[PDB]
Amino acid sequence: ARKFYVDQDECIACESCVEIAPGAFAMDPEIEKAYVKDVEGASQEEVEEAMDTCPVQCIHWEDE
């Protein structure tokens, strides 16, 4: 799967990514930021949907 990750510094905890892609994203109960729980847990189009929806655009691809 092309790699992706949440930049948790920026994350506003809206939960939209955990709603769109629940096999790939989860909330960390004690820092209140979202993180990738599985890079293979959503198809590439569902990942993109969650990335394009992020209000603060903090989920990034890492090709680099």
- Distance (Å, rounded) from C-alpha 60 to C-alpha 57? 8
Q: Are 59 and 12 in contact (CB under 8 A)?
A: no
Q: Are 6 and 56 in contact (CB under 8 A)?
A: no
Q: How far is the CB of 13 from ligand SF4 (least distance, A)?
A: 5
When CB distances are held under 5 to 8 angstroms depending on the partner's kind, the choice from ligand SF4, its own copies, none that residue 42 binds is its own copies
* Residue 17 assigned to a binding site: yes
Contacts with ligand SF4 by CB under 6 A lie at 6, 11-17, 34, 54-56, 58-59
Annotated binding site: 11, 14, 17, 54
